[model samples]
Target: MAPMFSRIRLATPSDVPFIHKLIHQMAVFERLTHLFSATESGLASTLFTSRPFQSFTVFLLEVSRSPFPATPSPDFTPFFKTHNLDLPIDDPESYNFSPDMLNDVVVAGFVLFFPNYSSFLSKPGFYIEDIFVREPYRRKGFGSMLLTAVAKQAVKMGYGRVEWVVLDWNVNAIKFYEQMGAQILQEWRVCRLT
Candidate 1:
Protein backbone atom coordinates (compact mmCIF):
# COMPACT_ATOMS: atom_id res chain seq x y z
CA MET A 1 0.00 0.00 0.00
CA ALA A 2 1.06 3.61 -0.53
CA PRO A 3 2.28 5.50 2.52
CA MET A 4 -0.50 7.06 4.49
CA PHE A 5 0.05 9.81 7.06
CA SER A 6 -1.38 10.18 10.54
CA ARG A 7 -0.88 12.45 13.48
CA ILE A 8 0.34 11.04 16.75
CA ARG A 9 -0.43 13.02 19.87
CA LEU A 10 2.64 13.59 21.99
CA ALA A 11 3.19 14.80 25.51
CA THR A 12 6.40 16.02 27.05
CA PRO A 13 6.95 12.96 29.24
CA SER A 14 6.72 10.39 26.50
CA ASP A 15 8.05 12.58 23.73
CA VAL A 16 11.26 14.09 25.12
CA PRO A 17 13.67 11.68 23.45
CA PHE A 18 12.22 12.30 20.05
CA ILE A 19 12.24 16.02 20.67
CA HIS A 20 15.81 15.91 21.89
CA LYS A 21 16.87 13.96 18.84
CA LEU A 22 15.13 16.43 16.55
CA ILE A 23 16.87 19.40 18.11
CA HIS A 24 20.19 17.57 17.90
CA GLN A 25 19.53 16.91 14.27
CA MET A 26 18.81 20.59 13.77
CA ALA A 27 22.10 21.56 15.32
CA VAL A 28 23.89 19.06 13.14
CA PHE A 29 22.21 20.39 10.05
CA GLU A 30 23.29 23.90 10.94
CA ARG A 31 26.85 22.74 11.56
CA LEU A 32 26.56 24.00 15.09
CA THR A 33 26.84 20.89 17.26
CA HIS A 34 27.64 22.49 20.61
CA LEU A 35 24.38 24.37 21.20
CA PHE A 36 21.71 21.97 22.43
CA SER A 37 20.59 22.49 26.06
CA ALA A 38 18.02 19.73 26.46
CA THR A 39 18.84 16.47 28.17
CA GLU A 40 16.26 13.69 28.05
CA SER A 41 15.07 13.96 31.65
CA GLY A 42 15.22 17.72 31.71
CA LEU A 43 13.30 17.98 28.48
CA ALA A 44 10.77 15.51 29.85
CA SER A 45 10.24 17.60 32.91
CA THR A 46 10.04 20.82 30.98
CA LEU A 47 7.86 19.77 28.06
CA PHE A 48 6.05 16.42 27.70
CA THR A 49 5.94 15.78 31.43
CA SER A 50 5.11 19.13 32.96
CA ARG A 51 1.88 20.96 33.73
CA PRO A 52 2.68 24.35 35.17
CA PHE A 53 0.89 26.19 32.39
CA GLN A 54 0.66 23.62 29.60
CA SER A 55 3.55 25.40 27.96
CA PHE A 56 3.75 23.38 24.77
CA THR A 57 1.92 21.17 22.31
CA VAL A 58 3.54 18.33 20.39
CA PHE A 59 2.57 15.91 17.63
CA LEU A 60 4.26 13.15 15.72
CA LEU A 61 3.67 11.89 12.18
CA GLU A 62 3.17 8.26 11.22
CA VAL A 63 2.12 6.08 8.35
CA SER A 64 -1.65 5.78 8.73
CA ARG A 65 -1.91 2.46 6.95
CA SER A 66 0.27 -0.57 7.12
CA PRO A 67 0.09 -4.08 5.66
CA PHE A 68 1.59 -6.17 8.46
CA PRO A 69 -0.45 -6.26 11.63
CA ALA A 70 1.47 -8.96 13.49
CA THR A 71 5.19 -8.54 12.94
CA PRO A 72 4.59 -4.78 13.03
CA SER A 73 6.01 -2.36 10.55
CA PRO A 74 8.99 -0.50 11.88
CA ASP A 75 7.73 2.45 13.89
CA PHE A 76 9.45 5.43 12.39
CA THR A 77 9.73 8.45 14.63
CA PRO A 78 7.68 11.40 13.39
CA PHE A 79 8.78 14.90 12.47
CA PHE A 80 8.01 17.68 14.98
CA LYS A 81 8.98 21.08 16.39
CA THR A 82 7.58 23.51 18.98
CA HIS A 83 5.90 26.88 19.53
CA ASN A 84 5.19 29.44 22.35
CA LEU A 85 8.01 31.58 23.59
CA ASP A 86 8.21 35.30 24.08
CA LEU A 87 9.12 37.37 21.02
CA PRO A 88 12.75 37.57 20.02
CA ILE A 89 14.62 40.43 21.63
CA ASP A 90 15.33 43.22 19.16
CA ASP A 91 19.12 43.48 19.56
CA PRO A 92 20.48 39.97 18.97
CA GLU A 93 23.25 41.57 17.01
CA SER A 94 24.89 42.67 20.27
CA TYR A 95 24.11 40.11 22.94
CA ASN A 96 26.00 36.85 22.94
CA PHE A 97 24.55 34.02 24.99
CA SER A 98 27.11 31.99 26.93
CA PRO A 99 26.96 28.41 28.21
CA ASP A 100 26.13 29.67 31.67
CA MET A 101 23.27 31.64 30.21
CA LEU A 102 21.42 28.59 28.91
CA ASN A 103 20.39 26.93 32.18
CA ASP A 104 17.43 28.65 33.81
CA VAL A 105 15.27 30.79 31.56
CA VAL A 106 17.17 31.54 28.38
CA VAL A 107 18.34 28.97 25.86
CA ALA A 108 19.34 29.27 22.28
CA GLY A 109 16.23 29.97 20.22
CA PHE A 110 14.85 30.90 16.77
CA VAL A 111 11.46 32.16 15.67
CA LEU A 112 9.36 31.83 12.51
CA PHE A 113 6.69 34.37 11.85
CA PHE A 114 4.45 36.26 9.34
CA PRO A 115 3.46 40.00 9.11
CA ASN A 116 4.74 42.55 11.59
CA TYR A 117 2.91 44.03 14.53
CA SER A 118 3.83 46.95 16.77
CA SER A 119 2.99 45.25 20.08
CA PHE A 120 1.66 41.96 21.34
CA LEU A 121 -1.68 41.33 19.71
CA SER A 122 -4.08 38.51 20.42
CA LYS A 123 -4.97 38.17 16.76
CA PRO A 124 -4.88 34.64 15.40
CA GLY A 125 -1.34 33.63 14.43
CA PHE A 126 1.66 31.51 15.51
CA TYR A 127 5.44 31.57 15.46
CA ILE A 128 7.80 28.62 15.48
CA GLU A 129 10.19 28.89 18.38
CA ASP A 130 12.27 26.29 16.58
CA ILE A 131 11.90 23.41 14.14
CA PHE A 132 13.92 20.34 13.23
CA VAL A 133 13.36 16.92 11.78
CA ARG A 134 15.91 14.20 12.42
CA GLU A 135 18.70 13.99 9.85
CA PRO A 136 17.38 10.64 8.66
CA TYR A 137 14.14 12.35 7.75
CA ARG A 138 15.38 15.56 6.15
CA ARG A 139 14.21 16.58 2.64
CA LYS A 140 11.15 14.44 3.16
CA GLY A 141 7.78 16.15 3.69
CA PHE A 142 7.98 15.90 7.48
CA GLY A 143 9.08 19.43 8.25
CA SER A 144 6.47 20.83 5.94
CA MET A 145 3.82 18.67 7.56
CA LEU A 146 4.78 19.79 11.03
CA LEU A 147 4.79 23.45 9.98
CA THR A 148 1.45 23.13 8.26
CA ALA A 149 0.03 21.74 11.48
CA VAL A 150 1.36 24.69 13.45
CA ALA A 151 -0.21 27.11 11.00
CA LYS A 152 -3.48 25.25 10.94
CA GLN A 153 -3.69 25.13 14.71
CA ALA A 154 -3.09 28.85 14.90
CA VAL A 155 -5.60 29.63 12.20
CA LYS A 156 -8.14 27.35 13.78
CA MET A 157 -7.69 29.30 16.98
CA GLY A 158 -8.27 32.54 14.99
CA TYR A 159 -4.75 33.61 14.18
CA GLY A 160 -4.56 35.98 11.22
CA ARG A 161 -1.08 34.88 10.20
CA VAL A 162 1.87 32.49 10.86
CA GLU A 163 5.58 33.15 10.52
CA TRP A 164 9.22 32.18 11.33
CA VAL A 165 12.83 33.27 10.90
CA VAL A 166 15.85 31.66 9.24
CA LEU A 167 19.54 32.42 9.30
CA ASP A 168 20.83 33.75 6.01
CA TRP A 169 23.37 30.95 5.98
CA ASN A 170 20.54 28.45 5.87
CA VAL A 171 19.72 29.35 2.28
CA ASN A 172 18.08 26.08 1.43
CA ALA A 173 15.67 26.40 4.34
CA ILE A 174 14.90 29.96 3.28
CA LYS A 175 13.95 28.64 -0.11
CA PHE A 176 11.79 26.00 1.49
CA TYR A 177 9.90 28.45 3.67
CA GLU A 178 9.43 30.93 0.84
CA GLN A 179 8.05 28.15 -1.29
CA MET A 180 5.60 27.43 1.54
CA GLY A 181 4.22 30.96 1.02
CA ALA A 182 5.97 32.58 3.97
CA GLN A 183 7.23 36.07 3.19
CA ILE A 184 10.79 36.58 4.34
CA LEU A 185 11.21 39.81 6.30
CA GLN A 186 14.45 41.44 5.29
CA GLU A 187 15.41 44.29 7.63
CA TRP A 188 14.79 43.49 11.29
CA ARG A 189 17.62 42.25 13.51
CA VAL A 190 17.49 39.92 16.53
CA CYS A 191 18.84 40.78 20.00
CA ARG A 192 18.67 38.65 23.13
CA LEU A 193 19.45 38.69 26.85
CA THR A 194 22.44 36.54 27.57
Candidate 2:
Protein backbone atom coordinates (compact mmCIF):
# COMPACT_ATOMS: atom_id res chain seq x y z
CA MET A 1 0.00 0.00 0.00
CA ALA A 2 1.07 3.63 -0.60
CA PRO A 3 -0.11 7.14 0.06
CA MET A 4 -3.61 7.80 -1.21
CA PHE A 5 -3.23 11.35 -2.56
CA SER A 6 -0.76 13.98 -3.74
CA ARG A 7 -0.91 17.75 -3.33
CA ILE A 8 -0.56 19.59 -6.60
CA ARG A 9 1.53 22.75 -6.37
CA LEU A 10 2.16 25.42 -8.97
CA ALA A 11 5.83 25.85 -9.76
CA THR A 12 7.45 29.10 -8.70
CA PRO A 13 10.70 30.69 -9.83
CA SER A 14 12.26 29.14 -6.76
CA ASP A 15 11.52 25.66 -8.06
CA VAL A 16 13.82 25.77 -11.10
CA PRO A 17 16.46 23.64 -9.41
CA PHE A 18 13.96 21.00 -8.42
CA ILE A 19 12.42 21.06 -11.88
CA HIS A 20 15.83 20.78 -13.51
CA LYS A 21 16.60 17.78 -11.34
CA LEU A 22 13.37 16.06 -12.28
CA ILE A 23 13.86 16.79 -15.97
CA HIS A 24 17.30 15.21 -15.79
CA GLN A 25 15.78 12.11 -14.27
CA MET A 26 13.00 12.07 -16.86
CA ALA A 27 15.50 12.34 -19.71
CA VAL A 28 17.29 9.33 -18.32
CA PHE A 29 14.04 7.44 -17.96
CA GLU A 30 13.05 8.23 -21.53
CA ARG A 31 16.42 6.91 -22.75
CA LEU A 32 17.26 10.31 -24.24
CA THR A 33 20.16 11.16 -22.00
CA HIS A 34 22.30 11.99 -25.00
CA LEU A 35 20.04 14.94 -25.83
CA PHE A 36 19.65 16.19 -22.28
CA SER A 37 21.29 19.58 -22.47
CA ALA A 38 18.94 21.80 -20.45
CA THR A 39 20.43 23.96 -17.71
CA GLU A 40 18.89 25.46 -14.56
CA SER A 41 18.90 29.05 -15.85
CA GLY A 42 17.57 27.85 -19.17
CA LEU A 43 14.63 26.21 -17.44
CA ALA A 44 14.04 29.17 -15.14
CA SER A 45 14.03 31.74 -17.92
CA THR A 46 11.78 29.57 -20.05
CA LEU A 47 9.14 28.67 -17.51
CA PHE A 48 8.70 31.80 -15.44
CA THR A 49 8.83 34.84 -17.72
CA SER A 50 12.46 35.47 -16.85
CA ARG A 51 13.34 37.29 -20.08
CA PRO A 52 10.54 35.58 -21.93
CA PHE A 53 9.35 31.88 -21.96
CA GLN A 54 6.51 33.01 -19.71
CA SER A 55 3.90 31.21 -21.73
CA PHE A 56 4.26 27.90 -19.92
CA THR A 57 3.24 26.77 -16.47
CA VAL A 58 4.24 23.83 -14.31
CA PHE A 59 2.66 21.79 -11.51
CA LEU A 60 4.37 19.71 -8.89
CA LEU A 61 2.72 16.66 -7.38
CA GLU A 62 3.74 16.50 -3.77
CA VAL A 63 3.46 13.49 -1.49
CA SER A 64 4.37 12.87 2.09
CA ARG A 65 7.78 11.21 2.28
CA SER A 66 11.08 11.10 4.04
CA PRO A 67 13.56 13.76 2.99
CA PHE A 68 16.83 13.15 1.13
CA PRO A 69 20.21 14.86 1.32
CA ALA A 70 20.47 16.73 -1.99
CA THR A 71 18.50 19.87 -2.51
CA PRO A 72 18.72 23.75 -2.88
CA SER A 73 21.81 24.21 -4.99
CA PRO A 74 23.78 27.45 -4.73
CA ASP A 75 22.50 28.68 -8.09
CA PHE A 76 19.25 29.63 -6.40
CA THR A 77 17.51 32.55 -8.20
CA PRO A 78 15.41 34.24 -5.55
CA PHE A 79 11.70 35.14 -5.44
CA PHE A 80 10.18 33.82 -8.61
CA LYS A 81 13.03 35.56 -10.45
CA THR A 82 11.38 38.84 -9.45
CA HIS A 83 8.20 37.84 -11.26
CA ASN A 84 6.32 37.31 -7.96
CA LEU A 85 3.86 34.70 -9.29
CA ASP A 86 1.31 37.51 -8.90
CA LEU A 87 -1.12 35.31 -10.69
CA PRO A 88 -3.39 33.24 -8.50
CA ILE A 89 -2.29 29.58 -8.32
CA ASP A 90 -4.98 27.87 -6.25
CA ASP A 91 -3.22 27.07 -2.90
CA PRO A 92 0.48 27.90 -2.55
CA GLU A 93 -0.54 30.84 -0.42
CA SER A 94 -1.72 28.53 2.35
CA TYR A 95 1.36 26.31 2.21
CA ASN A 96 4.71 26.73 3.82
CA PHE A 97 7.66 26.43 1.47
CA SER A 98 10.12 26.29 4.31
CA PRO A 99 13.07 24.00 3.71
CA ASP A 100 12.10 22.15 6.89
CA MET A 101 8.78 21.22 5.32
CA LEU A 102 10.73 19.29 2.74
CA ASN A 103 11.11 16.57 5.35
CA ASP A 104 7.36 16.16 5.50
CA VAL A 105 6.35 16.37 1.88
CA VAL A 106 8.59 15.90 -1.13
CA VAL A 107 7.70 16.38 -4.76
CA ALA A 108 6.92 12.91 -6.09
CA GLY A 109 6.46 14.02 -9.68
CA PHE A 110 5.64 16.96 -11.92
CA VAL A 111 3.84 17.98 -15.10
CA LEU A 112 4.81 21.02 -17.16
CA PHE A 113 2.41 22.39 -19.73
CA PHE A 114 1.90 25.39 -22.00
CA PRO A 115 -0.90 27.05 -23.89
CA ASN A 116 -1.48 26.64 -27.61
CA TYR A 117 -3.99 27.96 -30.09
CA SER A 118 -6.41 25.65 -31.91
CA SER A 119 -7.70 27.30 -35.07
CA PHE A 120 -10.22 24.47 -35.49
CA LEU A 121 -11.83 25.34 -32.18
CA SER A 122 -11.06 29.06 -32.46
CA LYS A 123 -9.73 28.72 -28.93
CA PRO A 124 -6.56 27.74 -27.09
CA GLY A 125 -5.58 24.40 -25.60
CA PHE A 126 -3.15 23.17 -23.05
CA TYR A 127 -0.17 21.29 -24.43
CA ILE A 128 1.74 19.12 -22.03
CA GLU A 129 5.46 19.23 -22.67
CA ASP A 130 6.38 16.75 -20.00
CA ILE A 131 4.78 14.52 -17.39
CA PHE A 132 6.95 12.48 -15.06
CA VAL A 133 6.63 10.46 -11.91
CA ARG A 134 9.61 9.03 -10.11
CA GLU A 135 10.43 5.34 -10.61
CA PRO A 136 9.26 4.46 -7.11
CA TYR A 137 6.03 6.42 -7.69
CA ARG A 138 4.93 4.77 -10.91
CA ARG A 139 1.74 2.63 -11.17
CA LYS A 140 0.37 4.40 -8.13
CA GLY A 141 -2.20 6.69 -9.84
CA PHE A 142 0.27 9.57 -9.79
CA GLY A 143 0.36 9.85 -13.56
CA SER A 144 -3.39 10.10 -13.88
CA MET A 145 -3.49 12.51 -11.01
CA LEU A 146 -1.05 14.78 -12.81
CA LEU A 147 -3.08 14.60 -16.00
CA THR A 148 -6.23 15.31 -14.09
CA ALA A 149 -4.76 18.50 -12.73
CA VAL A 150 -4.20 19.77 -16.25
CA ALA A 151 -7.60 18.65 -17.42
CA LYS A 152 -9.19 20.43 -14.52
CA GLN A 153 -7.24 23.56 -15.33
CA ALA A 154 -8.27 23.40 -18.96
CA VAL A 155 -11.88 23.27 -17.95
CA LYS A 156 -11.41 26.27 -15.72
CA MET A 157 -9.81 28.28 -18.49
CA GLY A 158 -12.42 27.29 -21.10
CA TYR A 159 -9.66 25.67 -23.10
CA GLY A 160 -10.54 23.74 -26.22
CA ARG A 161 -8.57 20.66 -25.12
CA VAL A 162 -5.59 19.25 -23.29
CA GLU A 163 -3.19 17.19 -25.36
CA TRP A 164 0.13 15.34 -25.14
CA VAL A 165 2.13 12.77 -27.07
CA VAL A 166 2.93 9.29 -25.88
CA LEU A 167 5.77 7.21 -27.20
CA ASP A 168 4.66 4.17 -29.23
CA TRP A 169 7.15 2.01 -27.39
CA ASN A 170 5.48 2.84 -24.10
CA VAL A 171 2.69 0.29 -24.31
CA ASN A 172 1.85 0.61 -20.66
CA ALA A 173 1.47 4.36 -20.97
CA ILE A 174 -0.70 3.94 -24.05
CA LYS A 175 -2.97 1.56 -22.21
CA PHE A 176 -3.12 3.94 -19.31
CA TYR A 177 -4.09 6.80 -21.60
CA GLU A 178 -6.83 4.72 -23.11
CA GLN A 179 -8.10 3.83 -19.68
CA MET A 180 -8.20 7.52 -18.92
CA GLY A 181 -10.44 8.10 -21.98
CA ALA A 182 -7.70 9.64 -24.11
CA GLN A 183 -8.00 8.96 -27.83
CA ILE A 184 -4.89 7.70 -29.60
CA LEU A 185 -4.71 8.73 -33.25
CA GLN A 186 -2.72 5.92 -34.74
CA GLU A 187 -2.88 7.57 -38.16
CA TRP A 188 -1.01 10.67 -37.10
CA ARG A 189 2.74 10.97 -36.79
CA VAL A 190 4.79 13.40 -34.73
CA CYS A 191 7.27 15.61 -36.56
CA ARG A 192 9.94 17.51 -34.68
CA LEU A 193 13.13 19.10 -35.86
CA THR A 194 15.00 19.30 -32.57
Candidate 3:
Protein backbone atom coordinates (compact mmCIF):
# COMPACT_ATOMS: atom_id res chain seq x y z
CA MET A 1 0.00 0.00 0.00
CA ALA A 2 1.11 3.54 -0.66
CA PRO A 3 1.93 5.69 2.34
CA MET A 4 -0.58 8.44 3.01
CA PHE A 5 0.28 12.01 3.78
CA SER A 6 0.08 13.12 7.41
CA ARG A 7 0.90 16.13 9.57
CA ILE A 8 3.80 16.64 11.99
CA ARG A 9 3.35 17.47 15.68
CA LEU A 10 5.29 19.33 18.36
CA ALA A 11 7.76 17.43 20.54
CA THR A 12 7.59 16.89 24.32
CA PRO A 13 9.75 15.87 27.27
CA SER A 14 9.96 12.12 26.76
CA ASP A 15 11.43 12.55 23.31
CA VAL A 16 14.80 13.77 24.53
CA PRO A 17 16.92 10.83 23.44
CA PHE A 18 15.49 10.57 19.93
CA ILE A 19 15.97 14.28 19.47
CA HIS A 20 19.46 14.09 20.87
CA LYS A 21 20.33 11.31 18.46
CA LEU A 22 18.82 13.19 15.58
CA ILE A 23 20.68 16.34 16.44
CA HIS A 24 23.91 14.41 16.76
CA GLN A 25 23.36 12.83 13.37
CA MET A 26 22.58 16.21 11.88
CA ALA A 27 25.73 17.70 13.29
CA VAL A 28 27.76 14.79 11.99
CA PHE A 29 26.22 15.14 8.56
CA GLU A 30 27.26 18.77 8.51
CA ARG A 31 30.79 17.79 9.59
CA LEU A 32 30.29 19.74 12.80
CA THR A 33 29.69 16.98 15.31
CA HIS A 34 31.83 18.80 17.85
CA LEU A 35 29.29 21.60 18.06
CA PHE A 36 26.43 19.59 19.55
CA SER A 37 25.38 21.04 22.90
CA ALA A 38 22.14 19.26 23.59
CA THR A 39 21.84 16.97 26.59
CA GLU A 40 18.82 14.81 27.37
CA SER A 41 17.90 16.89 30.39
CA GLY A 42 18.54 20.13 28.62
CA LEU A 43 16.37 19.27 25.61
CA ALA A 44 13.59 18.09 27.86
CA SER A 45 13.73 21.14 30.08
CA THR A 46 13.78 23.60 27.23
CA LEU A 47 11.60 21.97 24.56
CA PHE A 48 9.41 19.57 26.45
CA THR A 49 9.11 21.34 29.78
CA SER A 50 8.32 24.76 28.32
CA ARG A 51 11.55 26.43 29.30
CA PRO A 52 11.13 29.65 27.26
CA PHE A 53 11.25 29.87 23.50
CA GLN A 54 8.34 31.93 22.15
CA SER A 55 7.31 28.93 20.00
CA PHE A 56 8.65 25.76 18.45
CA THR A 57 7.35 22.88 16.35
CA VAL A 58 8.73 19.42 15.67
CA PHE A 59 7.08 16.90 13.35
CA LEU A 60 7.13 13.22 12.49
CA LEU A 61 6.38 11.13 9.43
CA GLU A 62 3.97 8.67 10.95
CA VAL A 63 2.83 5.42 9.37
CA SER A 64 -0.71 6.76 8.86
CA ARG A 65 -2.26 3.82 10.65
CA SER A 66 -4.83 5.71 12.74
CA PRO A 67 -6.33 9.16 12.64
CA PHE A 68 -5.40 10.48 16.09
CA PRO A 69 -3.34 8.42 18.46
CA ALA A 70 -1.23 10.34 20.93
CA THR A 71 1.41 7.67 21.15
CA PRO A 72 3.58 6.94 18.12
CA SER A 73 4.69 3.46 17.10
CA PRO A 74 7.86 2.19 18.74
CA ASP A 75 9.68 0.42 15.92
CA PHE A 76 10.65 2.87 13.22
CA THR A 77 12.40 0.17 11.21
CA PRO A 78 9.58 -0.25 8.75
CA PHE A 79 9.21 3.47 8.17
CA PHE A 80 12.94 4.00 8.06
CA LYS A 81 13.58 1.28 5.49
CA THR A 82 10.69 2.25 3.25
CA HIS A 83 11.69 5.88 3.24
CA ASN A 84 15.46 5.18 2.84
CA LEU A 85 16.44 7.28 5.85
CA ASP A 86 20.15 7.07 6.64
CA LEU A 87 20.37 8.68 10.03
CA PRO A 88 23.34 7.65 12.15
CA ILE A 89 21.20 4.94 13.71
CA ASP A 90 23.04 1.76 14.49
CA ASP A 91 23.32 -0.99 17.11
CA PRO A 92 19.70 -1.71 17.91
CA GLU A 93 20.87 -2.83 21.33
CA SER A 94 22.04 0.66 22.23
CA TYR A 95 18.84 2.58 22.98
CA ASN A 96 15.35 1.59 23.96
CA PHE A 97 13.84 2.65 20.64
CA SER A 98 10.42 2.28 22.15
CA PRO A 99 7.23 4.33 22.13
CA ASP A 100 8.16 5.62 25.57
CA MET A 101 11.02 7.50 23.96
CA LEU A 102 8.77 9.62 21.81
CA ASN A 103 7.43 12.96 23.00
CA ASP A 104 4.24 13.11 20.99
CA VAL A 105 3.58 11.13 17.83
CA VAL A 106 6.23 9.52 15.67
CA VAL A 107 7.91 12.30 13.69
CA ALA A 108 10.04 12.12 10.57
CA GLY A 109 11.15 15.73 10.41
CA PHE A 110 11.60 18.59 12.87
CA VAL A 111 11.85 22.39 12.85
CA LEU A 112 13.18 24.24 15.88
CA PHE A 113 12.41 27.93 16.04
CA PHE A 114 12.51 31.02 18.24
CA PRO A 115 10.97 34.48 18.22
CA ASN A 116 13.21 36.97 16.43
CA TYR A 117 14.48 38.95 19.43
CA SER A 118 16.72 40.79 16.97
CA SER A 119 13.86 42.28 14.96
CA PHE A 120 11.31 44.96 15.71
CA LEU A 121 7.78 44.13 14.76
CA SER A 122 4.29 45.54 14.78
CA LYS A 123 3.97 42.21 16.45
CA PRO A 124 6.86 39.92 17.34
CA GLY A 125 8.26 38.07 14.35
CA PHE A 126 9.50 34.48 14.37
CA TYR A 127 12.41 32.73 12.74
CA ILE A 128 13.19 29.12 11.95
CA GLU A 129 16.36 28.44 13.87
CA ASP A 130 16.86 24.92 12.60
CA ILE A 131 15.04 22.38 10.44
CA PHE A 132 15.68 18.84 9.25
CA VAL A 133 13.88 16.15 7.26
CA ARG A 134 15.14 12.59 7.64
CA GLU A 135 16.95 11.52 4.52
CA PRO A 136 14.51 8.86 3.32
CA TYR A 137 11.56 11.22 3.74
CA ARG A 138 12.94 13.91 1.49
CA ARG A 139 10.97 15.17 -1.58
CA LYS A 140 7.69 13.93 -0.14
CA GLY A 141 6.24 17.36 0.79
CA PHE A 142 6.80 16.69 4.49
CA GLY A 143 9.27 19.55 4.73
CA SER A 144 6.90 21.95 3.02
CA MET A 145 4.09 20.99 5.33
CA LEU A 146 6.30 21.38 8.38
CA LEU A 147 7.40 24.81 7.19
CA THR A 148 3.79 25.79 6.58
CA ALA A 149 2.96 24.76 10.13
CA VAL A 150 5.71 26.99 11.51
CA ALA A 151 4.54 29.93 9.41
CA LYS A 152 0.98 29.34 10.50
CA GLN A 153 2.10 29.66 14.11
CA ALA A 154 3.45 33.11 13.33
CA VAL A 155 0.26 34.04 11.52
CA LYS A 156 -1.80 32.78 14.41
CA MET A 157 0.22 34.90 16.79
CA GLY A 158 -0.37 37.94 14.53
CA TYR A 159 3.30 38.29 13.82
CA GLY A 160 4.04 40.61 10.90
CA ARG A 161 6.85 38.46 9.55
CA VAL A 162 8.53 35.06 9.86
CA GLU A 163 11.92 34.22 8.49
CA TRP A 164 14.82 31.78 8.42
CA VAL A 165 18.47 31.87 7.49
CA VAL A 166 20.10 29.36 5.15
CA LEU A 167 23.72 29.05 4.31
CA ASP A 168 24.62 30.39 0.88
CA TRP A 169 26.40 27.16 0.08
CA ASN A 170 23.34 24.98 0.62
CA VAL A 171 22.06 25.18 -2.93
CA ASN A 172 19.59 22.36 -2.49
CA ALA A 173 17.77 24.16 0.32
CA ILE A 174 18.02 27.47 -1.51
CA LYS A 175 16.30 25.99 -4.52
CA PHE A 176 13.62 24.37 -2.42
CA TYR A 177 12.73 27.53 -0.49
CA GLU A 178 12.79 29.56 -3.68
CA GLN A 179 10.29 27.20 -5.21
CA MET A 180 8.14 27.77 -2.15
CA GLY A 181 8.14 31.53 -2.80
CA ALA A 182 10.41 32.40 0.12
CA GLN A 183 12.59 35.32 -0.79
CA ILE A 184 16.10 35.80 0.47
CA LEU A 185 16.60 39.04 2.34
CA GLN A 186 19.63 40.08 0.34
CA GLU A 187 19.88 43.42 2.08
CA TRP A 188 20.63 41.84 5.44
CA ARG A 189 23.94 40.37 6.42
CA VAL A 190 24.66 38.30 9.49
CA CYS A 191 27.66 39.25 11.61
CA ARG A 192 28.70 37.22 14.61
CA LEU A 193 30.69 38.16 17.70
CA THR A 194 32.82 35.40 19.18
**Residues 22-92, model 1: lDDT tens digits:** 56766777788887676988766655443321234555443222221221012223333333233333323
lDDT of prediction 2: 0.68
Candidate 2: residue 27 lDDT (0-100): 89
How far residue 19's Cα lies from its native spot in candidate 1, in Å, is 1.3
lDDT of each: 0.49, 0.68, 0.60
Writing each residue's lDDT as its tens digit, candidate 3 over 1-90 gives: 343434455555666676777787689879997888889887776675443334454444343323444332131111122233334332
Clashes of each: 20, 0, 3
For each candidate in turn, the TM-score is 0.63, 0.75, 0.73
* Higher-lDDT candidate of 1 and 2: 2
Residue runs of model 1 more than 4 Å from their true location after superposition: 1-4, 48-54, 64-121
Superposed Cα deviation of residue 159, candidate 3 (Å): 1.2
lDDT of the structure predicted as candidate 1: 0.49
**What is residue 111's positional error in candidate 3, in angstroms?**
0.6
Residue-level lDDT tens digits of model 2 in 1-194: 22233466677788787788889988898789999999988988777773211367887876543322232212221111011122222324123333345355556678888888899779888888899887655666778888877887677668778888888888988998899899988888988997
Please give the distance, in angstroms, between residue 19's alpha carbon in candidate 2 and its true position after superposition.
0.6
